[PDB]
Design a protein around this ligand. Structure first.
Ligand code: ASP
Ligand code: ASP
Ligand code: ASP
Ligand code: CL
Ligand code: CL
Lengths: 163, 168, 163, 168
C-alpha cells in the first residue's frame, strides 16, 4: 500500500553549518535513507517543518494534523524531534478524521549525518510499522512500538519509556 | 519496575550484507555479521542475540546447509526470528523453512542486502530495521523482507541481473 | 623522523551528545584517522585542550608554546579550532625556543564525525607538511600552506586567505 | 585581484583505492576515481584538475599502459603531479617514470590505498591528503607516498603478504 512520509524536523535531520559554528535542522534524512533502500513500492515525502520539537506550539501540532488529513494514503510516517513526539502523537490520536490511518512517528537520538546514528535502523523499523500496524497512532523507537497515551520521553535515561 | 523482554532472535547465514575487504584475498570475503554492527547503535529497549549459523555467498548452499538452519530456528523458544542471508538462494531457504510444522507458531523473516553494509550506499541498515519490525509484527509464517516490502517465498523470485526480488 | 601531534580541540573534534542536544568538543579526530592510516613511522598524540579556540587567551597560547617546547621531536602537528588558529600560529612563530622545529597547525571546517568533512584529507596533508617543510610555523588548510603573519580567517568564503 | 594557482594535477590509473561494489558482477570492479570524492569536500583554495587515464587493477599493465601514463605526465603544464594507482605494480610504474628525462623538472608522486575508499576503515582519504602535500613539497623526482612516509621506488618493494611497501 502507498506510504506517505511527512518531515517535521528533529535531531534526525540536524546537519553542520559553518556560519552557525554548529548544527541546524537540515534537509530530511529520511530522503537520504530511502535513496539507497532500493524500494519496490510507492512512497512520497512532504516537508512540514524544520523545527527542534522543543519549540513546537499547539498550532504547529494543528498544522501537522491538517497535512495528515490532506493525505488520501492510510499508511503515514512522520519523522520528528523526540522531545515533543509524545505531544504530537497524543494530539493526532484525538482527530477522528485520521481514525482509518496507521500513523507512526519516529526520529533519531543522534543526527543521521553524525557517526553512530540510530536513524537508518529507525527509518526501516518505522516504515515497516506504518505498513503493518492496525489503524491508530504509534511511536516506533528503540526497536519497539510505543502507545503514546502510555509513553513518556525520559531524557535522563535517553530512551522513550512506558508510564 | 518493568523488565524489557527480548522476543526477537537473529540468525546469520552470511551473504553480500556481511562482505568485507581483506588484503589477503585482494577482495571481499564474507566477514562478521553486519546486523551486529547495526544493533550496536540502534539504542534497542530489548537485547537481541545474534547466532552465527554460516558464512557463505548463498550461491554455494546445500540441502543440509538449509537443514542445519531449519533445526537451529526450530530449537529457538522465540516466536520472532530474523535470518540474515545471501540474496541469490534466499527464496530456496525460505521455501524449505515454510514447510517445517515445528516453525508453525513462529514469525520467520529472511533479509540481507544487495550492497555490503561495509560498502558506501548500502541498503543494509534500512533492511535490518524493516526486517526486525516484520519479524515482530507479521502473523506466523515465513517471509522475505526486501525493498521496503514483504514477499511470499512461494510467489517470489530473485532477478540476478537487476539485484531485486520480484513476484511471479 | 618522529612526529608529535598535540590536540587543542576545534570543530575537527566535535561530536554529538544527547545530554547537550548538540555538539561538544569530543575525543581528538586525528586519532581516528591515524588508526586506519597503516603508518610505518613513529607518531604519538598528546591531548592539550578541548576548547573552542574562540575562548583561548594569551595565557592559553603561552601554555601551548611551552607544551610544544616540551617535545624533543622537531616535527609537530597541532590540531586546533580555526577561529584563533592564526593567533596561536603567530604566537608560536615568535618563540626562539621553537626555531629548530617544523610546527604545522591544522583542523577542519566540518567535524570529522559529520558527513562531508575535510578532516581526514587535512590530517594527511598536515602530517606530510610537518615532516617535509623547513623549520618554521605554518597553517595547513584547503590543500595549501599559509604563512601565519600573512594570513587571516575570512568567514565570507569560509576559508583562510592571504592578506 | 589575487588569482589562486592550481600547481597540482592528478591522474588516476585505477587500483584498490577506486574499487566499488557492482550488483551485476556480484563483487568489486574498478569504479570512478575515489580521489575526486575526497577533493570534493576538501574545501581547496585552488582547483585540482583530475584526469582519468586507466581503470585497471595494476596487474593488467603492459609497457603500452605505462607508456600512456608517461606521455600524459610529460605533457602536463604543472610541475607537481599525483598519480593514484594499484599498489601491486606501483613500484614498476614509478621506476619507469623515473627514467623519462621529460619528467626531470616535475615532482611526481604515486599513491593509492590498501583498502578501497568506498569500504569502511580505508587509508584512502589520509593517503590522498599526504600524497597531495608530498607532490607540492618534495624536490623534483618520482616517489611513492604510503604509510605516512615517502619511498624511493628504486629501493622499495610491495610486500603483498603484510600489505605494505618496505625497503629492499
Ligand atoms: N531536541 C530534539 C531531540 C531529538 O530529536 O532527539 C528534538 O526534539 O527536535
Ligand atoms: N551472491 C550474494 C548476493 C547477495 O547476497 O546480495 C549472495 O547470495 O550471498
Ligand atoms: N569555533 C571553532 C571553529 C573551527 O574549529 O572550525 C573553533 O575555532 O574552535
Ligand atoms: Cl551544536
Ligand atoms: Cl570481490
Amino acid at each position: 500500500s502507498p506510504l506517505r512520509i511527512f518531515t517535521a524536523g528533529g535531531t534526525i535531520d540536524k546537519d553542520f553549518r559553518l556560519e552557525e559554528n554548529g548544527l541546524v535542522v537540515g534537509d530530511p534524512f529520511v530522503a537520504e535513507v530511502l535513496k539507497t533502500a532500493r524500494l519496490a513500492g510507492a512512497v512520497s515525502i512532504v516537508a512540514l517543518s524544520r523545527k527542534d520539537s522543543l519549540d513546537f506550539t499547539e498550532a504547529d501540532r494543528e498544522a501537522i494534523g491538517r497535512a495528515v488529513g490532506q493525505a488520501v494514503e492510510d499508511h503515514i510516517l512522520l519523522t520528528h524531534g523526540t522531545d515533543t513526539m509524545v505531544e504530537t502523537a497524543r494530539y493526532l490520536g484525538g482527530l477522528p478524521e485520521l481514525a482509518g490511518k496507521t500513523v507512526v512517528l519516529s526520529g533519531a537520538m543522534v543526527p543521521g549525518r553524525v557517526g553512530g546514528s540510530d536513524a537508518a535502523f529507525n527509518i526501516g523499523f518505522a516504515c515497516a510499522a506504518a505498513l503493518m500496524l492496525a489503524p491508530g497512532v504509534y511511536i516506533a523507537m528503540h526497536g519497539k512500538v510505543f502507545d503514546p497515551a502510555k509513553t513518556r520521553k525520559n531524557r535522563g535515561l535517553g530512551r522513550f519509556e512506558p508510564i
